[PDB]
Design an enzyme around this catalytic site. Structure first.
Site, short mmCIF file in Angstrom:
data_model
loop_
_atom_site.label_atom_id
_atom_site.label_comp_id
_atom_site.label_asym_id
_atom_site.label_seq_id
_atom_site.Cartn_x
_atom_site.Cartn_y
_atom_site.Cartn_z
N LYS A 46 0.78 -1.27 -0.01
CA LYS A 46 -0.09 -0.02 0.04
C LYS A 46 0.70 1.22 -0.05
N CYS A 137 -13.36 4.55 16.84
CA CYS A 137 -12.08 3.87 16.53
C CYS A 137 -11.34 3.66 17.95
N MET A 138 -10.57 4.81 18.27
CA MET A 138 -9.45 5.23 19.33
C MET A 138 -10.27 5.60 20.77
N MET A 305 -8.70 -2.90 17.29
CA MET A 305 -10.16 -2.72 17.31
C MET A 305 -11.01 -3.81 17.88
N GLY A 342 -5.31 3.28 14.58
CA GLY A 342 -5.47 2.83 13.22
C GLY A 342 -5.14 3.88 12.20
N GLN A 343 -5.60 5.05 12.40
CA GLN A 343 -5.26 6.25 11.32
C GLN A 343 -4.06 6.84 11.58
N1 LIG Z 1 -4.94 -2.57 5.31
C1 LIG Z 1 -5.43 -1.82 6.13
N2 LIG Z 1 -4.95 -1.31 7.22
C2 LIG Z 1 -5.49 -0.47 8.16
C3 LIG Z 1 -6.86 -0.15 7.99
C4 LIG Z 1 -7.39 -0.34 6.58
O1 LIG Z 1 -8.51 -0.04 6.06
N3 LIG Z 1 -6.72 -1.22 5.67
N4 LIG Z 1 -7.44 0.88 8.62
C5 LIG Z 1 -6.46 1.27 9.74
C6 LIG Z 1 -7.57 1.71 10.73
S1 LIG Z 1 -8.15 3.18 11.03
C7 LIG Z 1 -7.57 0.81 12.29
S2 LIG Z 1 -8.50 1.24 13.37
C8 LIG Z 1 -6.74 -0.50 12.12
C9 LIG Z 1 -7.47 -1.52 12.62
O2 LIG Z 1 -6.76 -2.67 12.79
P1 LIG Z 1 -7.18 -4.08 13.41
O3 LIG Z 1 -8.13 -3.66 14.49
O4 LIG Z 1 -5.71 -4.80 13.89
O5 LIG Z 1 -7.95 -4.78 12.24
P2 LIG Z 1 -9.57 -5.42 12.45
O6 LIG Z 1 -9.54 -6.51 11.21
O7 LIG Z 1 -10.67 -4.56 12.06
O8 LIG Z 1 -9.02 -5.99 13.97
C10 LIG Z 1 -9.92 -6.75 14.36
C11 LIG Z 1 -9.29 -8.01 14.84
O9 LIG Z 1 -9.91 -8.32 16.08
C12 LIG Z 1 -10.78 -9.26 16.31
N5 LIG Z 1 -11.77 -9.41 17.22
C13 LIG Z 1 -13.19 -9.66 16.89
N6 LIG Z 1 -13.99 -9.87 17.72
C14 LIG Z 1 -13.31 -9.60 18.96
C15 LIG Z 1 -13.15 -9.74 20.45
O10 LIG Z 1 -14.35 -10.02 21.04
N7 LIG Z 1 -11.99 -9.50 21.21
C16 LIG Z 1 -10.78 -9.30 20.68
N8 LIG Z 1 -9.61 -9.19 21.52
N9 LIG Z 1 -10.90 -9.45 19.20
C17 LIG Z 1 -11.78 -9.48 18.29
C18 LIG Z 1 -11.13 -9.64 14.72
O11 LIG Z 1 -11.22 -11.09 14.80
C19 LIG Z 1 -10.04 -9.01 13.92
O12 LIG Z 1 -9.26 -10.21 13.51
O13 LIG Z 1 -6.08 -0.91 10.87
C20 LIG Z 1 -5.28 0.37 10.27
N10 LIG Z 1 -4.78 -0.25 9.10
N1 LIG Z 2 -18.14 -2.58 10.07
C1 LIG Z 2 -16.85 -1.90 10.55
N2 LIG Z 2 -16.96 -0.32 10.21
C2 LIG Z 2 -15.89 0.38 10.31
C3 LIG Z 2 -14.78 -0.22 11.06
C4 LIG Z 2 -14.55 -1.88 11.39
O1 LIG Z 2 -13.68 -2.10 11.72
N3 LIG Z 2 -15.82 -2.22 10.83
N4 LIG Z 2 -13.80 0.65 11.35
C5 LIG Z 2 -14.16 2.01 11.62
C6 LIG Z 2 -12.93 2.74 12.01
S1 LIG Z 2 -11.71 2.27 13.14
C7 LIG Z 2 -12.76 3.72 11.10
S2 LIG Z 2 -11.01 4.57 11.32
C8 LIG Z 2 -13.63 4.10 10.07
C9 LIG Z 2 -12.87 5.09 8.90
O2 LIG Z 2 -13.93 5.28 7.89
P1 LIG Z 2 -13.90 6.47 6.85
O3 LIG Z 2 -13.07 7.43 7.50
O4 LIG Z 2 -15.29 6.68 6.51
O5 LIG Z 2 -13.30 5.53 5.97
P2 LIG Z 2 -12.02 6.32 4.73
O6 LIG Z 2 -12.47 5.66 3.41
O7 LIG Z 2 -10.69 6.26 5.22
O8 LIG Z 2 -12.54 7.75 4.43
C10 LIG Z 2 -11.63 8.84 4.17
C11 LIG Z 2 -12.40 9.54 3.20
O9 LIG Z 2 -11.44 10.80 2.56
C12 LIG Z 2 -11.39 10.85 1.22
N5 LIG Z 2 -10.17 11.62 0.91
C13 LIG Z 2 -8.90 11.20 0.70
N6 LIG Z 2 -8.05 12.16 0.77
C14 LIG Z 2 -8.72 13.40 1.30
C15 LIG Z 2 -8.59 14.74 1.37
O10 LIG Z 2 -7.32 15.34 1.06
N7 LIG Z 2 -9.66 15.65 1.66
C16 LIG Z 2 -10.66 15.10 1.86
N8 LIG Z 2 -11.76 15.98 2.11
N9 LIG Z 2 -11.06 13.69 1.61
C17 LIG Z 2 -10.20 12.82 1.20
C18 LIG Z 2 -11.61 9.34 0.50
O11 LIG Z 2 -12.04 9.30 -0.55
C19 LIG Z 2 -12.39 9.06 1.78
O12 LIG Z 2 -13.88 9.09 1.33
O13 LIG Z 2 -14.32 3.24 9.68
C20 LIG Z 2 -15.04 2.65 10.74
N10 LIG Z 2 -16.15 1.62 10.30
S1 SF4 Z 3 2.14 3.68 7.26
FE1 SF4 Z 3 0.94 1.84 7.19
S2 SF4 Z 3 0.22 1.58 5.16
FE2 SF4 Z 3 1.99 3.10 4.99
S3 SF4 Z 3 3.70 1.94 4.44
FE3 SF4 Z 3 3.80 1.86 6.76
S4 SF4 Z 3 2.59 0.02 7.42
FE4 SF4 Z 3 2.24 0.39 5.12
MO LIG Z 4 -9.62 3.49 12.86
#
Ligand SMILES: Nc1nc2c(c(=O)[nH]1)N[C@H]1C(S)=C(S)[C@@H](COP(=O)(O)OP(=O)(O)OC[C@H]3O[C@@H](n4cnc5c(=O)[nH]c(N)nc54)[C@H](O)[C@@H]3O)O[C@H]1N2
Ligand SMILES: Nc1nc2c(c(=O)[nH]1)N[C@H]1C(S)=C(S)[C@@H](COP(=O)(O)OP(=O)(O)OC[C@H]3O[C@@H](n4cnc5c(=O)[nH]c(N)nc54)[C@H](O)[C@@H]3O)O[C@H]1N2
Ligand code: SF4
Ligand SMILES: [Mo]
Length: 720
Positions: A46, A137-138, A305, A342-343
């Site tokens: 990525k 998230c956090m 998460m 995460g973010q």
């Molecule tokens: N490739 C990629 N990387 C990312 C992101 C992305 O969109 N893509 N988003 C980023 C962001 S904003 C965030 S928040 C992080 C998220 O990073 P993670 O939280 O590491 O990813 P998730 O898959 O949402 O994590 C959930 C893990 O928690 C588990 N879980 C489910 N139920 C439970 C429970 O009851 N207890 C416990 N202990 N665990 C459970 C699920 O099985 C899952 O494998 O990733 C960040 N990195």
């Molecule tokens: N079911 C389920 N739902 C979840 C989660 C989950 O684990 N499970 N994770 C939650 C968590 S931890 C998070 S962090 C959220 C994240 O959820 P979102 O924040 O809604 O997801 P993103 O796609 O990161 O949104 C970023 C947006 O910014 C836009 N963008 C990119 N660059 C720029 C810029 O310079 N300016 C502007 N204005 N826009 C831009 C992209 O096109 C995109 O629409 O999702 C949550 N939702």
């Molecule tokens: S900040 Fe996260 S997504 Fe970007 S290169 Fe590092 S591990 Fe990969």
């Molecule tokens: Mo997140």
């Protein structure tokens, strides 16, 4: 090809890798890892494919207005857009008071953008309706840190990974979610084969393939699991009384003062033989994880998460901290309690910046009358301008919008129509016929734009300069590498012009650019336990990030918080080696939180747990990673993971179209039958806009952090 390399930060995860952007004749042509930032020159796939994203033509490049609800988006000038935005917002406050308007932002916003937005709303308009996607998230990790230590954010750094002798990795799919940190963990076990890894997650992920032990506990039972670990630690005399006698306080199940003897009595409710049966795990995993944790030279916990997106999220964070406090596995290299963010900028922009409904910048709180007066003085406000009442937290915000209480909303760099929980409820709120919804959005395919009344074209990522504060308290500059296309404008400037036109005192938005705002933010942090006054734009230009606290230009930054001789917030002559100064007596707190379960548990009618997760190739809503063909080759579309032994027992085979159904909706998905999900669990990803899985999930929240329980709800599956 490149004539110059421009230093920045990866656009994606909170690992916060530094990036060098290679440019030729005003165009980006290459990317490499910053060798001087923590990632030491390494990006994941990525990070490494960011140039196609930055160079995409599929961009919002001009302002768009929807004259009428249900209408089509049509071109409109920047001046007409700013006037429309300013007059609607102004008129709303004039008619109905500040609480009729709201900011909904992002941990992807530059720290400077979120700072200006937060100040406009709280200091200019006089409303505390500033929230953002880090609530999703956090927020639970903030609650967990503030209740255990009195201050937000980890006390360790990524560097502790290199000296940890045990990892406790709970609710984190680090492999797919933090790939550069996962490699650093794997490398540590490679370099020291003695290193022990416990991975605790109901799903068996790629993260488990370096683990000594994978604990596949039943969703929501991890609090009982962690209490049981503490029971073992105390029972086998593996705790650290020299530490906890001096540096810890104990609070009972009611949140009242207690002691170690009280703790032991409480822990009798969590004996391993009982908990093993609650968690559906072999009893030996409890003893094995406890012993690895407490016997090791240096133990680091990491979580994301699976722990936070929980109605017991703050409490689950507390229990991790409990384990570190009873063992003194803290405030030493390798030994620390590390929340993964995460973010890329939930830490710097929203938490540290106090750009949430109940917060003020740099560790201040809305209900604190003294913190309000400090900010009115710092910001040049009239007395009482800052409302005493917290604004709407994210879930309540969209409810308020649904009722018509919030009339005007700005949405910025987030996609809530795709990512908020309980989408059918949420889509209705966002369809209020008298709502005015302004979207600042870079990509036209974000589903939220379907609700927008006004769309403003932003400068993307390194099309402008600005700070990202990653998971380890590192603040890093991205310098501008290329011009924004079309009419794209830096959001710092858009916000300033919006405020001016909406009647906000121009002294309140005295900023030509992001550097101007950074300098005011520095001053607002001065004297606080966040103090980053020493992070001048010039040091940030030359450095690959600095770690706060960093109170002066001659200060290197801080790795071990709460530690005398390392942390400048600990007086040089403090009597004790450690000082948890966020608590009035300098002691951290062990909380005897009772273990419960999800808000919506399985029953006869919906007998499965449903969770939602991430996948390595896709970033959130895939509006960015969707522009990269290479990232589409493994998992082009959504699927449901089903347990092998569950499926066989119910006549489901691999590839079958299945219906996933909750109380809230039903969705058809291809079945991905294997051993990844433990029995009694199924799992859906959220990257696919054709399968809005948040329609299935419930909105129940941690009553303290207000984080939604995205990780657990109840479902059923049948063959389509
Ligand atoms: N490739 C990629 N990387 C990312 C992101 C992305 O969109 N893509 N988003 C980023 C962001 S904003 C965030 S928040 C992080 C998220 O990073 P993670 O939280 O590491 O990813 P998730 O898959 O949402 O994590 C959930 C893990 O928690 C588990 N879980 C489910 N139920 C439970 C429970 O009851 N207890 C416990 N202990 N665990 C459970 C699920 O099985 C899952 O494998 O990733 C960040 N990195
Ligand atoms: N079911 C389920 N739902 C979840 C989660 C989950 O684990 N499970 N994770 C939650 C968590 S931890 C998070 S962090 C959220 C994240 O959820 P979102 O924040 O809604 O997801 P993103 O796609 O990161 O949104 C970023 C947006 O910014 C836009 N963008 C990119 N660059 C720029 C810029 O310079 N300016 C502007 N204005 N826009 C831009 C992209 O096109 C995109 O629409 O999702 C949550 N939702
Ligand atoms: S900040 Fe996260 S997504 Fe970007 S290169 Fe590092 S591990 Fe990969
Ligand atoms: Mo997140």
């Amino acid at each position: 090809r490149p004539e110059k390399w421009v230093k920045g930060v990866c656009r994606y995860c909170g690992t916060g890798c530094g990036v060098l952007v290679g440019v030729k004749d005003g165009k980006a042509v290459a990317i490499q890892g910053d060798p001087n930032n923590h990632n030491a020159g390494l990006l994941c796939l990525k990070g490494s494919l960011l140039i196609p994203v930055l160079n995409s033509k599929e961009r919002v490049t001009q302002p768009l207005v929807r004259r009428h609800k249900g209408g089509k988006l049509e071109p409109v000038s920047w001046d007409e857009a700013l006037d429309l935005m300013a007059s609607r917002f102004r008129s709303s406050i004039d008619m109905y008071g500040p609480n009729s308007v709201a900011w909904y932002g992002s941990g992807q916003c530059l720290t400077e953008e979120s700072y200006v937005a937060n100040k406009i709303f709280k200091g200019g308009f006089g409303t505390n309706n500033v929230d953002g996607n880090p609530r999703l998230c956090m927020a639970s990790a903030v609650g967990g840190y503030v209740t255990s230590f009195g201050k937000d954010e980890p006390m360790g750094t990524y560097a502790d990974i290199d000296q940890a002798t045990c990892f406790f990795i709970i609710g984190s799919n680090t492999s797919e979610a933090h790939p550069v940190l996962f490699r650093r963990i794997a490398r540590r076990k490679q370099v020291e084969p003695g290193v022990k890894i416990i991975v605790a997650d109901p799903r068996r992920t790629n993260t488990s393939r370096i683990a000594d032990m994978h604990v596949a506990f039943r969703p929501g039972t991890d609090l009982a699991f962690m209490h049981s670990m503490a029971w073992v630690i105390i029972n086998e005399e593996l705790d650290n009384p020299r530490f906890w006698q001096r540096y810890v306080n104990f609070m009972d199940a009611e949140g009242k003062p207690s002691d170690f003897e009280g703790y032991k009595a409480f822990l009798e409710n969590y004996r391993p033989e009982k908990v093993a049966e609650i968690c559906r795990v072999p009893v030996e995993q409890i003893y094995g994880a406890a012993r690895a944790f407490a016997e090791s030279a240096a133990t680091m916990s990491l979580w994301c998460m699976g722990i936070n997106q929980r109605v017991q999220g703050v409490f689950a964070n507390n229990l991790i901290h409990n384990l570190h406090l009873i063992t003194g596995q803290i405030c030493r290299p390798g030994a620390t309690s590390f929340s993964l963010t995460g973010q890329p900028n939930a830490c710097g922009g929203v938490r540290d910046g106090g750009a949430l409904s109940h917060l003020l910048p740099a560790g201040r709180a809305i209900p604190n009358a003294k913190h309000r007066a400090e900010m009115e003085k710092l910001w040049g406000l009239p007395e009482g301008r800052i409302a005493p009442e917290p604004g709407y937290h994210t879930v309540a915000l969209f409810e308020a919008l649904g009722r018509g209480d919030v009339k005007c909303m700005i949405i910025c760099e987030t996609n809530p129509a795709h990512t908020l929980p309980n989408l059918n409820k949420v889509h209705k709120a966002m369809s209020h016929p008298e709502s005015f919804i302004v979207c600042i959005e870079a990509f036209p395919d974000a589903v939220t734009l379907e609700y927008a009344d006004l769309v403003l074209p932003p400068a993307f990522w390194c099309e402008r300069d600005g700070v990202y504060g990653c998971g380890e308290r590192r603040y890093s500059l991205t310098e501008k590498a290329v011009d924004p296309p079309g009419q794209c404008r830096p959001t710092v400037n858009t916000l300033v012009e919006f405020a001016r036109r909406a009647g906000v005192d121009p002294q309140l938005v005295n900023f030509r650019n992001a550097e101007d705002v950074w300098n005011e933010w520095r001053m607002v942090s001065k004297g606080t336990t966040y103090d980053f006054w020493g992070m001048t734009r010039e040091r940030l230009r030359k450095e690959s990030g600095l770690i706060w606290p960093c109170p002066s230009e001659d200060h290197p930054g801080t790795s071990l918080r709460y530690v005398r001789g390392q942390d400048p917030c600990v007086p040089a002559d403090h009597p004790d080696r450690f000082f948890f100064y966020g608590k009035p007596d300098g002691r951290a707190v062990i909380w005897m939180r009772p273990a419960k379960g999800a808000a919506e548990e399985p029953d006869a009618e919906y007998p499965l747990y449903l969770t939602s997760m991430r996948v390595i190739d896709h970033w959130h809503t895939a509006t960015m990673t969707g522009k990269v063909p290479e990232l589409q080759k493994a998992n082009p579309i959504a699927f449901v993971e089903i347990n092998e032994e569950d499926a066989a027992r119910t006549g489901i085979k691999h590839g079958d179209s299945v219906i996933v159904e909750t109380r809230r909706d039903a969705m058809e998905l291809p079945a991905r039958v294997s051993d990844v999900c433990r029995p009694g669990l199924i799992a859906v990803p959220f990257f696919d806009p054709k399968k809005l899985v948040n329609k299935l999930f419930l909105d129940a929240t941690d009553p303290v952090s207000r984080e939604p329980e995205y990780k657990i709800c109840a479902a059923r599956v049948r063959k389509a």
